[PDB]
Amino acid sequence: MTIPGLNAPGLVPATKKPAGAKPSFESYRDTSHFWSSQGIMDSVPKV
Amino acid sequence: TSIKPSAQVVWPVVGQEILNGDVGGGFSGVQITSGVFQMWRASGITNETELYWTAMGGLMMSALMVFAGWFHYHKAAPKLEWFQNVESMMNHHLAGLLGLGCLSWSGHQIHISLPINKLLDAGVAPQEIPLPHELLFNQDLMAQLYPSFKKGLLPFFTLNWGEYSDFLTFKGGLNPITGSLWLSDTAHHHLALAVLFIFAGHMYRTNWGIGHSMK
Amino acid sequence: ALVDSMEGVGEETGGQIWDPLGISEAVSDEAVMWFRASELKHGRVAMLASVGYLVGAAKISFPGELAKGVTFASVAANGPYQAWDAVPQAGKLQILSIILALEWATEAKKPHYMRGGVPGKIEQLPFDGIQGLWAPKIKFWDPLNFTGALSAEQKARKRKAELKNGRLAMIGIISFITGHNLPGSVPALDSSF
Amino acid sequence: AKSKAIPFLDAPPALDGTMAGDKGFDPLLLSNVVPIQWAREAELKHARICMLAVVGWVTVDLGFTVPYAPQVSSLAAHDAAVDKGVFLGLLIPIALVEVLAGIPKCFQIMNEPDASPGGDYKFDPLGIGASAEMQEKEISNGRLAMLAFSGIVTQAALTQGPFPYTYNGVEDLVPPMQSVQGALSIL
Amino acid sequence: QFNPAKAFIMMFSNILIICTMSIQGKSLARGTPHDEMVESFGITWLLAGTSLGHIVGAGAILGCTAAGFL
Amino acid sequence: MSKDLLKYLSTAPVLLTAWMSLTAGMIIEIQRFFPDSLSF
Amino acid sequence: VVYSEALPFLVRRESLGPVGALVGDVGFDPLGFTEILPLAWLREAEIKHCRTAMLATFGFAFTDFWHFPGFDYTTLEAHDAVIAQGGMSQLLLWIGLLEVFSAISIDQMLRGSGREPGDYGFDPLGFASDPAKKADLQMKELANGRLAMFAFGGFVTQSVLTGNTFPYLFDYQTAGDIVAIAAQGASP
Amino acid sequence: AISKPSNAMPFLTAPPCQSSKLPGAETGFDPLYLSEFIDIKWAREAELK
Ligand code: CLA
Ligand code: KC2
Ligand SMILES: CC1=C(C#C/C(C)=C/C=C/C(C)=C/C=C/C=C(C)/C=C/C=C(C)/C=C/[C@@]23O[C@]2(C)C[C@@H](O)CC3(C)C)C(C)(C)C[C@H](O)C1
DSSP: OOOTTTSSOSSEEOOOOOOOOOOOHHHHHTTSSSSSHHHHHHSSOOO | OOSOOEEEOOOSSSSGGGGSEEOSTTOEEEEOOSOHHHHHHHHTOOSHHHHHHHHHHHHHHHHHHHHHHHHHHHTOOOOHHHHTOHHHHHHIIIIIIIIHHHHHHHHHIIIIIHHHHHHHHHTOOTTTSOOHHHHHHOHHHHHHHSGGGGGTTHHHHTTOGGGGGTTSOOOOSOBTTTTBOOHHHHHHHHHHHHHHHHHHTTOBOOSSSOSBOOO | OOTTTSSOOOTTTTSSOOOSSSHHHHSOHHHHHHHHHHHHHHHHHHHHHHHHHHHHHHTOOOSSEEETTEEHHHHHSSOHHHHHHHSOHHHHHHHHHHHHHHHHHHHHOSSOTTTTSOTTOOOSSTTSSOTTOOOOOOOSSOTTOGGGGOOHHHHHHHHHHHHHHHHHHHHHHHHHHHHHHSTTSSSSOOTTO | OBOSSSTTSBOOTTTTTTSTTOOSOOTTOHHHHSOHHHHHHHHHHHHHHHHHHHHHHHHHHHTOOOTTSOOOOHHHHHHHHHHHSTTHHHHHHHHHHIIIIIHHHHHHHHTOSSOOOTTOOOOOTTOOOOOHHHHHHHHHHHHHHHHHHHHHHHHHHHHOOSTTOSTTTHHHHOGGGSOOHHHHHHO | XOOHHHHHHHHHHHHHHHHHOEETTEEGGGTOOHHHHHHHTTHHHHHHHHHHHHHHHHHHHHHHHHHSOO | OOHHHHHHHHSHHHHHHHHHHHHHHHHHHHHHHSOOOSOO | OOBOSSSTTSBOOSTTOSTTSSTTOOOOOTTOHHHHSOHHHHHHHHHHHHHHHHHHHHHHHHHHHEEOSSOOOOTTTHHHHHHHHTHHHHHHHHHHHHHHHHHHHHHHHHHTOOOOSSOOOOOSSOTTOSHHHHHHHHHHHHHHHHHHHHHHHHHHHHHHHHOOSSSOOOHHHHHSOTTOOSOOOSOO | OOSSBOSSOTTSBOOTTTTSOSTTOTTOOOTTOHHHHSOHHHHHHHHHO
16 A cells, blocks of 8 residues: 555645635535435445 | 335344335335324425434434423422412413414414425425525515515505415315315414414413403 | 823914814713824824825836736836735735734733823834744834934924824825815826826 | 603602613603613613614715625615625624623623613723713714614605605705795795 | 504504403493502503404404405 | 442343343344354 | 623623633623533533644644645545545544543543543643643633634635635635725626 | 542543552553452453463
8 A cells, every 4th residue: 555655755735726716505505414415315324 | 195105214134124115215114104204294394404404403402401301400490489370371381382382383384384385286396496495585486476475564564464365265175286284274273373372371460460360 | 191281282273272072071081092092093104105195196116026027117007096906915915914913013012002001102112022923123113213312302392293294194195095086176186196 | 759751740760860861751651560771771772773773874875885785775775785695794793792792781680680780881992981971972862863763764665765765855854945935925 | 554444443442442441350441540540550551451452453453344344 | 420320320220221232232243143043 | 799801791600610710711601601511511621622623723724735645535525535435433433532531531520530621631742841831821722722613613614615725715805806995896 | 630640641530450569550541440340350360361
C-alpha cells in the first residue's frame, strides 16, 4: 500500500474548483442525510 | 389500493425471513394493520424525511417528558393546594388543551392537508407536490387551489364566513376518490370543536370574580 | 470632560460654546467625551480624505505599479471617485485590515476617553503592551517627535488649530462627495472632480 | 383622588406619580389586573418598535434604500423583501435579543422582587443619561410614534400614495393651499 | 366591520349582554349600581360582557345573513 | 455507578434479564454461524 | 444585589455559584440552565465542546488544502467516503474508548471524587504547571474554544452554501469589490 | 483535586489494585475498577496464564 511518507508523498495538495455560483438549496438538501429520502435511507450503519 | 401496507422487517436467522412476505412495492416485510399509513396520508406526509424528523421530535419530547417527571418530584413538587384547583384545571383542559389542540389541528389541515390531499386525488405524484412550507405562505398557490384564500382573513374578522365555503364545507358522505371523509369537512369539524371547547373552558371560577363553582 | 473646560470654542462662534441645540445640556459628561473623541476622529479622517481627494482630482500619482499590470495612472485616470473602485480588492482589504488593527488597538487602551482618558488623545505606540503581538515602537502620532519642541501653550494653540482645520475638512470632503453625486450642488468643483 | 387626565374619575392607586410618563390616565383600571412593571415593559417595547418603524418607513418611502434592495415603496417593501429572500435574517437578531433579554427580564419582573424596572435594559453605551425628563421624553416620543405608525400604515394602505399619506397630499394637511377662493367668496 | 347593520347588531348585543349579565347575583338589570359593579369586578366586568356579547352577536349576525339581510 | 447503582444492577431481575439476554444472543449467533443443525 | 456582568439588567441567578468560581463567569445565563442541570456537568460539556470544535475547525481548514495520498475526497464528502472506507469506524472506536473513560471520570466527579469540571490532567509539555498561569490559560482555552464553535459552524454552513474551498465566500465576494462606493445595481 | 488518583490516570480515583503488593501494582490502570469486583490474586493468576 501507500505508506504516507515512505513510498508516497506525505500531505498531498487537494483538488479545488476556482470559485463558483451558489448551489441551489434543493441541490444539497435533496442529497443531505437528514432532509432527503435517499439520504435518510443511506444514513444507516453497515456491517 | 394494490400495495399492502408494511412497516416491519424480520432478520434472517432461523427461517423467520419468510415472514417478510410480498407486500408490493418491491418491498418484503410484515404487513401492518394499524392504519398509520392512511393516517400519514391524511396528515399530508409525502416523504420519508418528514417521518424521520417527526420521529426525532418525538424522541426529544420523550426526553423532555422524562426530565419533567424527574423535575416535578425531585426538584419542584407542587402542593395539595395546587393539585385541588379543579376549576382552573377544567378551564385549561377545555380551552387550553382541547380547544387549542383542535384549533392548531384545524390550521394544520387547512394549510397543509387540504392542498396536498387534493393534489394527490387530482393525480399529482408525491415528488411534484409543493412542500408544506411552500404551501404555508404561498397564498397565490392556495388561491389557485381554493379560490376563497385570495380574500385573506378579512372575511373571517368581518363575519362574512360564507366566503370560506370552498375549503370549509358540510358536504358529508365519503370522498369518491379516497372513499373516506372529506378533509375540508374534517377541518371545519375541528375548527367548530375548537370554538366550542374554548367557549366551554370559560365556565369555572378562578382568581377573578366571574365563573362557576362546581361545589 | 465638561464642555466648559473643553477646547474648541473659537472666535468664529464668539468665544463661546457653539451648541445651538441643547445637546451638551441634555447629555451627561461621558457622552461629551465620546462626542469630542468622535469629533477629532472625524476631523482627522476628513483632513486626510480631503487632501487625498484633491490629489486624486489633480491626477498626481506615484511613479510605478499599484499592482502588476495596474498602474497608479491607470487607476487614477478615470477620477478620484472611481479610483477606489479601480483599486484591486486585496489592496483595500489590506488597508481596511490595518485600519481595523489601529482602531481596535486605540480602543483597547485602558484609560479610555469615556472612562478617564483625554478624548481625542490617541495613545502613541498603540501596538505596545499587547501579548502575542510585537510591533516596532513607531509612534502612531508624531513618529519623528515633532511635538517635543513645542510648549504646553503652543500645543494647546495647535490643538485648537487641529479642531478648526478638522471641521473645515469634514465640510470640504462632504462638499466633494455631494458635488460628485449631485452635480451643481457644490460649485468650484470642475469636471475633474 | 380625582385623576388628572380624567377629572371625573378617581385615579388608580398603582399609578401614583413616580413612574415616567404618568398622567393619571387609566380609566379601565388595567393596572390592577395587569402588573405595572409588565405593562411598562410592554409599553416601552411597543414604543421603541414604533419609533424605529416610523423612521424606517419614512426613509424608505422618501427614497433611501440599501444597495441590492428592491426599489419599492414601504407598503410593498415587506412583500418585496420576502420575495427576494433576505428577511429572516432580520428576524435572527430579533430572536436573539428577545430570547436572551426579554424572556429572562420578563421572568425577573414577574418573579424576582429585586429587578430593574420595565424597559430598563441598562443600555446606555454613550452615557447620555436616564434622567426623569429623558425618560419622560422617551415615553412621549414613543407614544406619539405608536399613534403615528398606526396612522401611517392605515393611510398608506388606504391611499397607496406618497409620504403625506393623504388623498390630495399636503393640501389635506393645509386647507388654504386648496383654493381659498370660496373662503374669499363667503367673505 | 363593513356594514352599519352588522355593527349595530354587534354593539346592541354587547350592550344587552353587559346590562343584563349577572356575576354572583350582581347585574345592572337587577338594580346593582354601575359604581358597585366596577368596584367589585372591574375590567373583568367589561371583558366578560363583551366576550359573550361578541359570541351572541356573531351568532345573530351569521343567522341574519343566512336568513337574508346582512 | 455508585455502590448503590451496582447493587441495583446486581438485583435479581436485572441480572436475570442480562444473563438471559446474553444467553439468547449466544444461541442466536450460534444459529447464524452454524444454521440448520438438526444433527451433530 | 449582584447583577450579571454580561446582562446588567438581570440579577445573577444563584445556581451559577459564587461570582467567579469558574473562569469566565460573566454571569451569562439568561435561560437559567444551571437550575436544571449541575454546573460541573455543564462545564465538562463546555470544555468538551470547546476542544472538539477547535480540532474540528482546524481539521476542516486543513483538509480544504491538504489530504493524505489514500484519501482523495473533498472535506464535505470525506465523512461519507471514509465511512465507506472504514476509517471513521476506527475513529469512533478509539474516541469511544476515550469517551468511556471520560464518562467514568464525569460520574466520579459528580459523585464527589474531587476532579475539576474538565481537568483530565493532560499536561505533558508543562504549560500551565505554574499555578499563577493556570487560571489565565483556562480562560484562554475557554475563549478560544467558544470562538471555535462559531468558527466551525460558519465553516460548515458557508462551505455548503457557497461551494468554495477555503474562504467560504461567494464568488462575488471573492472576485468582485466588497469595498465599492460607486452605486450598485440589483445583483452583487 | 482527587485525593488518591490513579497513577496511570490522574483524573480517576485510585483502584484497589493500586494499593496492593502485586508486581506492577504501581500503575493503577483500572478505569472499569474490575479489581474491586474480581479478587486481585485470581485476576493476576489469569493475567499471567
Ligand atoms: C392556530 C392555527 C392557525 C395558524 C397557525 C395559522 C396561520 C396562518 N394563517 Mg390561518 N387559519 C386558521 C388557523 C391558523 N392559521 C383557521 C382555523 C382558518 C379558517 C378560518 C384560517 C384561515 C386562513 C386563511 C384564509 C389564510 C390564513 C393565512 C394564515 C397565515 C397568516 C399570517 C399572519 O397572520 O401572520 C401574523 C403575523 C404576526 C403575528 C407578526 C409576527 C411576524 C413574524 C415575526 C414573521 C415570521 C415569518 C417566518 C418565521 C419566516 C417565513 C419566511 C418565508 C420566506 C418562508 C398563516 C400561515 C393566510 C395565508 O397565508 O394563507 C396561505 C390566509 O390567506 N389562514
Ligand atoms: C495601508 C497601507 C498598506 C500597508 C501597511 C501594506 C503593507 C504590506 C506588507 C507588510 C509589510 C506587505 C508584505 C504587503 C504586500 C503587498 N501589498 Mg500592501 N500594504 C498597504 C496597502 C496596499 C495597497 C493599497 C495595495 C497593496 C498591495 C500589495 C501587494 C501587491 C500584490 C500584487 O502585485 O498583486 C503586496 C505583495 C497591492 C495589491 O494587493 O494589489 C493587488 C495594492 O493595491 N498594499 N503590503
Ligand atoms: C481531545 C478530546 C476528544 C476528542 C477528539 C477528536 C474528535 C479526535 C480526533 C482525532 C483524529 C481525527 C485522528 C485521526 C487519526 C488518523 C490516523 C491515525 C490515520 C490512519 C490511517 C491509516 C493507517 C491508513 C490510511 C490509508 O490511506 C492509506 C495510507 C493507504 C490506502 O491504501 C488506504 C488506507 C485507508 C489504508 C474527546 C475524547 C471527544 C473529548 C475530550 O474531552 C477531548
